[PDB]
Design a protein around this ligand. Sequence first.
Ligand code: MG
Ligand code: MG
Lengths: 344, 345
Amino acid sequence: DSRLAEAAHSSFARHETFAPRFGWLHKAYMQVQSNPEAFLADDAPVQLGVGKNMVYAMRYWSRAFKLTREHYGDDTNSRAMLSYPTWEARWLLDEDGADPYLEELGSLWLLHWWLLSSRPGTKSWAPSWYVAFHLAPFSRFTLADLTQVIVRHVNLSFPEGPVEASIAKDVDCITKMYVPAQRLRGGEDLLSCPFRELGLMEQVGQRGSSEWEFTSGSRPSLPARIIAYACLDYAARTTRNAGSISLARLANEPGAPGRAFRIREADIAAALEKVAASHQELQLVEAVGQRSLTFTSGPFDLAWDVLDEQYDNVRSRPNFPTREDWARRYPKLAEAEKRELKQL
Amino acid sequence: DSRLAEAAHSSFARHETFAPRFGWLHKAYMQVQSNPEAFLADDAPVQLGVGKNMVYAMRYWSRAFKLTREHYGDDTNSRAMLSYPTWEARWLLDEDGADPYLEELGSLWLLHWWLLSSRPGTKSWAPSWYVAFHLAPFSRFTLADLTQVIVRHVNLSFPEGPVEASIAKDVDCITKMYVPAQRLRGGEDLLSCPFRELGLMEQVGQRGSSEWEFTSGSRPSLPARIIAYACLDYAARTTRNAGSISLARLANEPGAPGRAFRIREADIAAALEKVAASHQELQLVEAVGQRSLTFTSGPFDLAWDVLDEQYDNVRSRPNFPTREDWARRYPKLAEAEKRELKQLD
Ligand SMILES: [Mg+2]
Ligand SMILES: [Mg+2]
């Protein structure tokens, strides 16, 4: 088994037991935009306004949410892994972007998709999150049961061999990231975490009992265009031209929006139907008779047409850079992608 | 039944049913700091980064959370109410301040207290919230129930009166502010609201059914210094000298922390023990045999010692302004307070 090795980097507990914070995403984008050394400077804890271990966590979460890519010097400098903002970060978090203050719940659903997402050249930095949402056998678990599940997947997927204590720390942090704070004990310490608003995870049988579970209701906070974006972005993992993808695969394949968002096939179809009605190039077709999503040109570009429309077409704004503008401004983003590729 | 009139201004539905947004608090502070006309300018939507239909909601929430005050400018033959940031906003929301990005849940508890709080010279801007937390005789309700208890309290307090439709909009907004996003139904519509993390309101018994309730469990996200601040801030409403206030009043009196935070007397007692252990001027006393909190000096200054401690003593940082420094930069803050105090005929 190497579903996981093919989708995720070997990366555990680099969040340093810290769940994401809005202030960290915001401040990381602002500093890194003009300073590649913003996380590595001896200056960082005061320049970022956080403790020293929070600097690394900030750096990790930037990487994990696909808001930055890392690559060496030179100009020398060193082997130092400097950070570079992605075009998606410029699109989302810029003061001129889609949702710089994460006012819309669809933006959190989007960031959640990027944390789990993977494609050739760009794997996930949260293998424990990927196992939990895409590969775990059961919806209810103890933290030690889920920990054991990830250990077994890491053992069959990576040459290194599992660090149980680090994987246990991922499981603590998943819990803090998705579960309501009333189901947490803080020895006051308790921090906000905006991904709790997604309602993806709950305590069970609350003593609080030792068990936790992922939910399975409807997702009124998940916008249709966010589902449609993820389905077309998932289709674009393997195709760059016109074509189709079955709804069954979108609902059930590991990596796809059904498991990422924990939504049923019917909720995917309902989102795609609503979005298709506004986009001539997209249709739901019932074949033999299973439903398929069709697209008359490459699905990556249509994905971003649907996503940009959810935020009133950010790419139309004055002086908004194109991906090709961004790539020339930050050529190391492509170089980081290439070195991921030349392992395949 | 003048309780609501003494506690709250006659202000209903000015938020247009938009629940608070962190970006709204943060950007309004960044702009009002240097521009008293931030909410009135032709270019407000672009400079505040919001739609034209959101500017007033944003202006309202800043005032309601005691983050701004409003007063006429120095501009003759003009009645427009200009905005000025409060010292509390400088302490909390500045990049140099306590929690500019609302990273700690105690900051949301605190903002919630500010929304509900009331003092001679600074009443609440959220009468429907005041009624819902402090005056309603029940805790479980349909939205039509909550609307009608507010309507009943408003007719006793404000002759002028909003229309019922305005109060209903307040109640929709109360719901979206506090209940989990999974209980709401949009058109996509749903916005984040960080006050939902406080776990204060939940859907109950549904189907159908149409019921809601304020919750009543334990509050592990409510820090003890936040409780003690509110208790001392509450005592300071009526006294500026050494004195005392009973735990029963703190836990049960309308306007006090027990009803604002929906916590029981023992939870208040436990928070106050923790804080009195580091504060020799605070004590929990047994009298006959009711417990009281006592303070050997003025409660308001002790309140802010306790609150500033929760955030690592922000007032000690280099160049942090005193309230005297701030009142000289923004003289109309005191003018807006004096205006309201002389409405207390
Ligand atoms: Mg480390
Ligand atoms: Mg308006």
